[PDB]
Amino acid sequence: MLQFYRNLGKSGLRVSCLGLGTWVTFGGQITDEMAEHLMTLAYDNGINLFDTAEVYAAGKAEVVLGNIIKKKGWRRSSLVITTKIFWGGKAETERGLSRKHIIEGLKASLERLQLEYVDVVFANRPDPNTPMEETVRAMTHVINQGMAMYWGTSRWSSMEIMEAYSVARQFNLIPPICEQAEYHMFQREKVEVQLPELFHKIGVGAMTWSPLACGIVSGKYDSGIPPYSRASLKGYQWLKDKILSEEGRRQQAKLKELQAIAERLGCTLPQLAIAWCLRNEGVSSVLLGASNAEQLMENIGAIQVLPKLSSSIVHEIDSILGNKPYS
Amino acid sequence: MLQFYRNLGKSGLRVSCLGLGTWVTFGGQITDEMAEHLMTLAYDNGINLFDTAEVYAAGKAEVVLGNIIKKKGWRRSSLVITTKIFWGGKAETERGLSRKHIIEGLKASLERLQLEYVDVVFANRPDPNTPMEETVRAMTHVINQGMAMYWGTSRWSSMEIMEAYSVARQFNLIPPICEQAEYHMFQREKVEVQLPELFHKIGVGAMTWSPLACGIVSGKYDSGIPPYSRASLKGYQWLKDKILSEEGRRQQAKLKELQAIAERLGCTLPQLAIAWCLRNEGVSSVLLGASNAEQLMENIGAIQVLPKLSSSIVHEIDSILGNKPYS
Amino acid sequence: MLQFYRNLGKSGLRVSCLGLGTWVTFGGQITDEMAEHLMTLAYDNGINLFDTAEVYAAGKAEVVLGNIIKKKGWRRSSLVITTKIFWGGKAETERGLSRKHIIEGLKASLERLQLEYVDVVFANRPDPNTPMEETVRAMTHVINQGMAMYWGTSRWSSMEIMEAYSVARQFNLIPPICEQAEYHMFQREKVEVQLPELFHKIGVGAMTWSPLACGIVSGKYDSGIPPYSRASLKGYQWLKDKILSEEGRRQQAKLKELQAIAERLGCTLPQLAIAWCLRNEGVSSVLLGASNAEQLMENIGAIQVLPKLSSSIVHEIDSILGNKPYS
Amino acid sequence: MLQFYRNLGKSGLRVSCLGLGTWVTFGGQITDEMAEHLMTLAYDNGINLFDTAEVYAAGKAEVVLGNIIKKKGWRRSSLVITTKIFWGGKAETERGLSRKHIIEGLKASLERLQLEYVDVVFANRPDPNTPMEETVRAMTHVINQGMAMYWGTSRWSSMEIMEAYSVARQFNLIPPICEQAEYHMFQREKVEVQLPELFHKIGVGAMTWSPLACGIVSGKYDSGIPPYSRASLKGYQWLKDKILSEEGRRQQAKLKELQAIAERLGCTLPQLAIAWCLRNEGVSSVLLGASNAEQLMENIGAIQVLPKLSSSIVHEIDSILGNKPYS
Numbered sequence A, B, C, D: 001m002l003q004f005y006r007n008l009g010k011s012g013l014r015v016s017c018l019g020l021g022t023w024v025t026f027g028g029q030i031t032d033e034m035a036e037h038l039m040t041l042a043y044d045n046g047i048n049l050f051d052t053a054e055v056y057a058a059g060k061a062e063v064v065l066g067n068i069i070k071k072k073g074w075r076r077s078s079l080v081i082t083t084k085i086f087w088g089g090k091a092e093t094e095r096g097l098s099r100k101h102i103i104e105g106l107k108a109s110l111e112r113l114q115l116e117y118v119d120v121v122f123a124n125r126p127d128p129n130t131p132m133e134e135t136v137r138a139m140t141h142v143i144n145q146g147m148a149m150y151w152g153t154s155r156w157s158s159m160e161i162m163e164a165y166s167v168a169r170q171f172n173l174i175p176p177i178c179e180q181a182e183y184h185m186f187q188r189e190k191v192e193v194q195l196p197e198l199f200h201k202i203g204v205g206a207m208t209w210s211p212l213a214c215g216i217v218s219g220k221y222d223s224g225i226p227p228y229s230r231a232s233l234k235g236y237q238w239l240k241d242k243i244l245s246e247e248g249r250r251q252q253a254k255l256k257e258l259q260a261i262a263e264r265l266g267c268t269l270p271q272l273a274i275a276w277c278l279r280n281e282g283v284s285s286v287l288l289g290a291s292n293a294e295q296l297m298e299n300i301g302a303i304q305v306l307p308k309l310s311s312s313i314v315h316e317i318d319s320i321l322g323n324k325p326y327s
């Protein structure tokens, strides 16, 4: 049976199995009014996890997220707000995981969010120019300063996450509680094989992103790049190329076969994809993305699909994908 | 000879052998005017220990306690105020011993109390969803932040209290100074056998609660549930059932025999019961409960009974109760 | 050659070899105007060390000391202000070295002093009811909170000071930098034998008090208790009895012989006594006491006596006193 | 190829290979208007490193630097501001590396700078009267207090820097990230031989000063002390004597030969000297000094000289200097 709320890794932080992200949309692709409606729908449906980053829309995503929280007046204690730090400006010192940028970056993010603290502050990616000890000491400092409750990693290799733990235990600092990693039918290796090891060894939880591979898994690009789609937005040529790549067309081919299973289960492809991401209880929460209310409500409906993901169905999906990693 | 003031465990915190609790009464069963009178009587009689919790009357108990302190103008340095954290709201993240709720919960409690800090912050019960290290780190954090002077446990098993100590010594954090445990003639095992071990091994003190078993030991329920009694209050059906249970009637049977001893000593059953709780010097303080001034003054009179609790009397009481635990 | 300024123990805090205390006088025996003049004379003569305590004149000494500092406008960075904590009120919890009283006591002292911090906060005496770890953790906390730069002990045995060091090194806390001990011709054992060991082993410095044994060494009580003398003040019967005791008269007998040496050196008995206290370079600073400007200026003149304290003179003084401790 | 921005030692702090210092000039030799122009030129040319000290012009240098930052409105996150502590006043306690002066000194510097924190706080020189542990604990404290991001040493021997590291690792404190050392054609030993060892062993970076030996390397003193030159300023007789010393004239002799190489490379002597200081990648940044815009722009032009410092050129320079240290 699905437990809607679960611990993020071994930490005491309880999050909904689904969260709502703000990449591309908040302060960018969608209006603040649409953003307000989406967050309200999420909150009213039990979602307590909202993710953002200092880099999203050059800080505007955080401003919008913060405005909604203040306008709606929801109790701060009922929300789990997370933000990621790494890209905070054009100046040399305004990027990275140095103590200087972690403190300056988080302080600026909190100011934009109109919050005293975030529940989890994440390193948006690894920093090849800053030693682990400095970063872990900085993360520990902002937590001790009450600017964050916990910290986590994103896009870090399992060895790098273990290195952070090593530094934390050697210098009696605070270890990370979660790794925010990409997870969907076409990106499974890290989450299915590596993360479970980190959970058992050092309690690291898995909060996944892009469950629909930026919308690709929806099947919407089955015949070209639809107008208004993310892949058609300015600054997202990389996504369009990926979709139009040889491999991208392959993916669409497999999606048609997966569509057959969805109809069979009585759900949509996106609902099948999102439910699939939560099938295994190694994933603490899946961060959703949505440009409108129809998509968000559809996505939230993935919860009803879970009970239907039998061993046979899963095996059938693995046969189609043909990318089941080795354990 | 009885020493009215004593250290709470091995810590330097000095508390009166009797304290006044706020469960059921403050902000609930009794008026704020009655609450003011009761706290004033306690304070004027040397009591410096006052206990509350974020969950009592949904925060109203703390508001009332805080209003009295401010109105009476007693020096903060002359008071020992304690509050318990665990149930702070209906949202998923508003309960438990996670760092998030410990900080948010205590901050909200202090705001209601109109205090900068409590002397002891207690975990109201064990949290099966939060690792010990997180909880001990959080408790240590609020103490270092000046929101609490010390921390303690409540309703924790002796192994769990030792686990908190283990974590504290392994990561150089602050260990707990006290366990708030139930203690009365019908619940003796933990306080008489387990707590003494913790005192000698890790200095944990014992602050006990419900010395009259919610009023049962008073003998008032000898013939049914009296009107206005706690057991007749809305939301306390559990107490009524307990009193009307097979075991509950048994307890009343033994109380009649204990009543004979009380008359013999020239005191009331409640005074005998409370004095009994303080007979052994393993108990640092007993938290009293009272819905009116007659009960409180009667209860405080238990101090004069102590000198009379001879070895013979104690043995006689053990014979009647027949529940003397094994050491 | 005498170095007027020296390190307090092995710490980096530099103090004048003479300091000015506030016991009995400030906010008590002398007017605030006299207090202002005395502190000004001290400061203008190079003294940068001023000592007080929460217990002196029930907090009034600190208020007077603070008023003078604010009125004169001396740079805070040019002063070394020390206060002692232990007796802060009539309530049970308003005394001792518990974390509660150390924090509440120092906070109240700083408020009275109108200062953000003291340079050294001292435990006024040992606390038999509070474990060392709690006290050292509390002292470390107020230093980390910026309420004090360093901490020290007073009236503690050399074993107790070593215990504080043990706790500090075991839990990585801050060790004490100084012990404020009584030192004069009739009380030499601890300072001459024990303190030097602590300096070499754990860097503890010696700041001494009552160099004239409350005025006894001045010879003023050679024929009874002079009017207006400290021994004649209300609340100082203990001093009068000490002076009028069999041992006290003995002391006066030896003082007459010491007076002969003083005349010979061309100085007064008090100057000889104070210079004697600084003869050995094991004493970092001697805290002076004075009820008027004549005494203070006389006392400060002890510095010119030092060059004259030859080995012969010292041996001659030891012969008269007959209390040279064993090394 | 030259990387304009580089890590300061192994820390995550990224600095421009050239920085601008404020010694002698800011708040002293040059007007605030000239200072503003120089800092603006530096900033606009990519320099993000600005150095000062509490002792420069008795605090006026920091005031001027702070006024410029506030007036220009540059983002704090785009700047790396460093200040040095040691000489903060005439009083005994207003100098040194004691916890008292480190905290009071840095607090006063920040107030003058109108900044909440500096990126790096440096000990301006070693303190023979303060134990290393006290100093490292104090440096760690101001960093934890958010008054500085990191700390460093200046003018410390390689053994003393290693001692700071030893203390930091023994007591789990923060180690230094950089040593600010003198480096130019006539002072090479420490930077070329000792500092590289510290970089590899404990990650300490090298930020060098006086690349032109106070202007001597410019060749301007080839025929006496030019009017308005630093050596002619009041309070700099020491520099004049050094230039007019036997050794100083020698240096000028070698400068004439170096001038030949400069012309050959198509650059000025100062550009050759500064580029020389950056030839080796063991130096993280070179702090420039300038009394006017012509000098600063000339100095910044040293960057174009680097590509020209071939092995032959370097060897030729070593032959002339004849002071190549032994590795």
Ligand SMILES: NC(=O)C1=CN([C@@H]2O[C@H](COP(=O)(O)OP(=O)(O)OC[C@H]3O[C@@H](n4cnc5c(N)ncnc54)[C@H](OP(=O)(O)O)[C@@H]3O)[C@@H](O)[C@H]2O)C=CC1
Pocket (backbone or CB within 6 Å): A020, A021, A022, A023, A024, A025, A051, A052, A084, A124, A154, A155, A180, A181, A208, A209, A210, A211, A212, A213, A214, A215, A216, A218, A220, A228, A229, A230, A231, A270, A287, A288, A289, A290, A291, A292, A294, A295, A296, A298, A299
């Ligand atoms: N740590 C990291 O580096 C990263 C973190 N994240 C986090 O994860 C969150 C989710 O990632 P995101 O890539 O947005 O998620 P998805 O992969 O689920 O893509 C969501 C996007 O796909 C489209 N879509 C969503 N639902 C449907 C539907 N039912 N039918 C058709 N199209 C649909 C929408 O785009 P459109 O309508 O414009 O086509 C929407 O914006 C982010 O907001 C962020 O918080 C994301 C990436 C990286």
Ligand SMILES: NC(=O)C1=CN([C@@H]2O[C@H](COP(=O)(O)OP(=O)(O)OC[C@H]3O[C@@H](n4cnc5c(N)ncnc54)[C@H](OP(=O)(O)O)[C@@H]3O)[C@@H](O)[C@H]2O)C=CC1
Pocket (backbone or CB within 6 Å): B020, B021, B022, B023, B024, B025, B051, B052, B084, B124, B154, B155, B180, B181, B208, B209, B210, B211, B212, B213, B214, B215, B216, B218, B220, B228, B229, B230, B231, B270, B287, B288, B289, B290, B291, B292, B294, B295, B296, B298, B299
């Ligand atoms: N840590 C934990 O989980 C717990 C902590 N506590 C703490 O302990 C405190 C005391 O517990 P509580 O259960 O109230 O204590 P008791 O068991 O002593 O019960 C007190 C209640 O019994 C009745 N009573 C008291 N004295 C007399 C008397 N002389 N004659 C007749 N009836 C009397 C009153 O109820 P009425 O008049 O309504 O019948 C009164 O409210 C609490 O306020 C709280 O601070 C309590 C429980 C749990």
Ligand SMILES: NC(=O)C1=CN([C@@H]2O[C@H](COP(=O)(O)OP(=O)(O)OC[C@H]3O[C@@H](n4cnc5c(N)ncnc54)[C@H](OP(=O)(O)O)[C@@H]3O)[C@@H](O)[C@H]2O)C=CC1
Pocket (backbone or CB within 6 Å): C020, C021, C022, C023, C024, C025, C051, C052, C084, C124, C154, C155, C180, C181, C208, C209, C210, C211, C212, C213, C214, C215, C216, C218, C220, C228, C229, C230, C231, C270, C287, C288, C289, C290, C291, C292, C294, C295, C296, C298, C299
């Ligand atoms: N840590 C601790 O427990 C203690 C700390 N202290 C500290 O030490 C300081 C000094 O101690 P205190 O006992 O006052 O010092 P002294 O033993 O030097 O006694 C000073 C007193 O003696 C008299 N006196 C001083 N100089 C002369 C003189 N030249 N001729 C005649 N009489 C003189 C005055 O008293 P009068 O004129 O009234 O006779 C004066 O108040 C205190 O203020 C306090 O800061 C002191 C005791 C204990």
Ligand SMILES: NC(=O)C1=CN([C@@H]2O[C@H](COP(=O)(O)OP(=O)(O)OC[C@H]3O[C@@H](n4cnc5c(N)ncnc54)[C@H](OP(=O)(O)O)[C@@H]3O)[C@@H](O)[C@H]2O)C=CC1
Pocket (backbone or CB within 6 Å): D020, D021, D022, D023, D024, D025, D051, D052, D084, D124, D154, D155, D180, D181, D208, D209, D210, D211, D212, D213, D214, D215, D216, D218, D220, D228, D229, D230, D231, D270, D287, D288, D289, D290, D291, D292, D294, D295, D296, D298, D299
């Ligand atoms: N940690 C420490 O103890 C020390 C740190 N420092 C730091 O290093 C910085 C730089 O040191 P500084 O000694 O000023 O540097 P330089 O050795 O480069 O000397 C700079 C001075 O030389 C002259 N000069 C500069 N460029 C030219 C040029 N192109 N042609 C002719 N004359 C020129 C100017 O003086 P003028 O025009 O007056 O002749 C200028 O003020 C300082 O500002 C400070 O921040 C410096 C010393 C010690």
Ligand SMILES: C[C@]12C=CC(=O)C=C1CC[C@@H]1[C@@H]2C(=O)C[C@@]2(C)[C@H]1CC[C@]2(O)/C(O)=C/O
Pocket (backbone or CB within 6 Å): A010, A011, A012, A149, A150, A151, A174, A175, A176, A177, A201, A202, A203, B131, B132, B133, B134, B135, B137
């Ligand atoms: C949540 C926690 C504590 C607070 C925090 O900010 C970060 C972490 C991360 C790693 C956790 C840790 C614990 O609470 C204790 C854990 C969970 C540990 C990993 C192993 C662990 O050491 C363990 O399993 C004890 O049995």
Ligand SMILES: C[C@]12C=CC(=O)C=C1CC[C@@H]1[C@@H]2C(=O)C[C@@]2(C)[C@H]1CC[C@]2(O)/C(O)=C/O
Pocket (backbone or CB within 6 Å): A023, A053, A055, A056, A084, A087, A124, A125
């Ligand atoms: C554009 C960006 C920001 C600036 C930049 O110099 C380079 C990149 C590359 C990749 C980006 C990144 C982000 O902005 C954050 C992204 C987009 C990341 C990949 C995933 C990501 O990490 C994230 O957070 C998902 O939402």
Ligand SMILES: C[C@]12C=CC(=O)C=C1CC[C@@H]1[C@@H]2C(=O)C[C@@]2(C)[C@H]1CC[C@]2(O)/C(O)=C/O
Pocket (backbone or CB within 6 Å): B010, B011, B012, B149, B150, B151, B174, B175, B176, B177, B201, B202, B203, C131, C132, C133, C134, C135, C137
């Ligand atoms: C009070 C204290 C210190 C402050 C605090 O917040 C919590 C505790 C709890 C555990 C205590 C501890 C001590 O002070 C030292 C003690 C009392 C210890 C248990 C054993 C102990 O280690 C001991 O016995 C030294 O002899």
Ligand SMILES: C[C@]12C=CC(=O)C=C1CC[C@@H]1[C@@H]2C(=O)C[C@@]2(C)[C@H]1CC[C@]2(O)/C(O)=C/O
Pocket (backbone or CB within 6 Å): B023, B053, B055, B056, B084, B087, B124, B125
């Ligand atoms: C109602 C409550 C709160 C909400 C809830 O979901 C479940 C319970 C159960 C048991 C309760 C608890 C409290 O509210 C606090 C209580 C009442 C506890 C038992 C003792 C207690 O721990 C305490 O503090 C005594 O006063």
Ligand SMILES: C[C@]12C=CC(=O)C=C1CC[C@@H]1[C@@H]2C(=O)C[C@@]2(C)[C@H]1CC[C@]2(O)/C(O)=C/O
Pocket (backbone or CB within 6 Å): C010, C011, C012, C149, C150, C151, C174, C175, C176, C177, C201, C202, C203, D131, D132, D133, D134, D135, D137
């Ligand atoms: C001043 C200091 C540091 C700051 C402080 O608040 C208290 C102390 C007390 C004990 C000191 C300590 C030191 O700085 C290092 C010392 C001085 C130590 C005793 C021995 C020592 O460990 C030593 O000798 C190293 O050689």
Ligand SMILES: C[C@]12C=CC(=O)C=C1CC[C@@H]1[C@@H]2C(=O)C[C@@]2(C)[C@H]1CC[C@]2(O)/C(O)=C/O
Pocket (backbone or CB within 6 Å): C023, C053, C055, C056, C084, C087, C124, C125
């Ligand atoms: C009166 C006092 C305070 C109250 C009390 O219950 C008992 C005493 C006894 C001894 C006193 C003490 C003080 O007040 C501080 C004194 C006077 C101490 C002896 C030296 C002392 O420690 C000190 O500080 C010298 O100045």
Ligand SMILES: C[C@]12C=CC(=O)C=C1CC[C@@H]1[C@@H]2C(=O)C[C@@]2(C)[C@H]1CC[C@]2(O)/C(O)=C/O
Pocket (backbone or CB within 6 Å): A131, A132, A133, A134, A135, A137, D010, D011, D012, D149, D150, D151, D174, D175, D176, D177, D201, D202, D203
């Ligand atoms: C920057 C740092 C961390 C923050 C800080 O305030 C000071 C330092 C100085 C020393 C550094 C340290 C590290 O981050 C880890 C380093 C860089 C270390 C020296 C060796 C090191 O231990 C290492 O090499 C791990 O591989």
Ligand SMILES: C[C@]12C=CC(=O)C=C1CC[C@@H]1[C@@H]2C(=O)C[C@@]2(C)[C@H]1CC[C@]2(O)/C(O)=C/O
Pocket (backbone or CB within 6 Å): D023, D053, D055, D056, D084, D087, D124, D125
């Ligand atoms: C004058 C000064 C300050 C006062 C003093 O009693 C003695 C000196 C001597 C040497 C000086 C010093 C400074 O003022 C800072 C200087 C000038 C240092 C040598 C280099 C220095 O350390 C520095 O910072 C370069 O800019």
